[PDB]
Amino acid sequence: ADIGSEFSGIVQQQNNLLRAIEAQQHLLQLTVWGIKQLQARILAVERYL
Amino acid sequence: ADIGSEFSGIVQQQNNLLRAIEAQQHLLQLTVWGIKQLQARILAVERYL
């Protein structure tokens, strides 16, 4: 009824929030990869010099 | 009543969580910019050498 509708709106929104957190975690992981790549390259430079 | 108060506490908290996710996305975007900037600069170095 309307109480069921209220619960279902809330749970649907919880799933949305969870999905956003999950996609953001993939983004965070992509930034960590990119940082490690750059750190490795800066070292190779630093050692050449 | 108290059921309404319970729902309103929960929805208010959902809005907070959403707002945190939104600000964190801006932070993620700032880190992606910073990584791209550094990648471009490391390349210019790498090509000089």
């Binding site: 929104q13 949305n16 929030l17 956003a20 953001q24 983004l27 992509l30 790549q37 | 959403l18 992606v32």
Partner: peptide
């Protein structure tokens, strides 16, 4: 070719950002 792979990286970033914007768009209508 890290170039092809940094291009991969960028496309992955772009895809996840597009998905997050989509989810945020659906979360405002709730």
């Amino acid at each position: 070719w890290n170039e092809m792979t940094w291009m991969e990286w960028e496309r992955e970033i772009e895809n996840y950002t597009k998905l997050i914007y989509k989810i945020l768009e659906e979360s405002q209508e709730q």
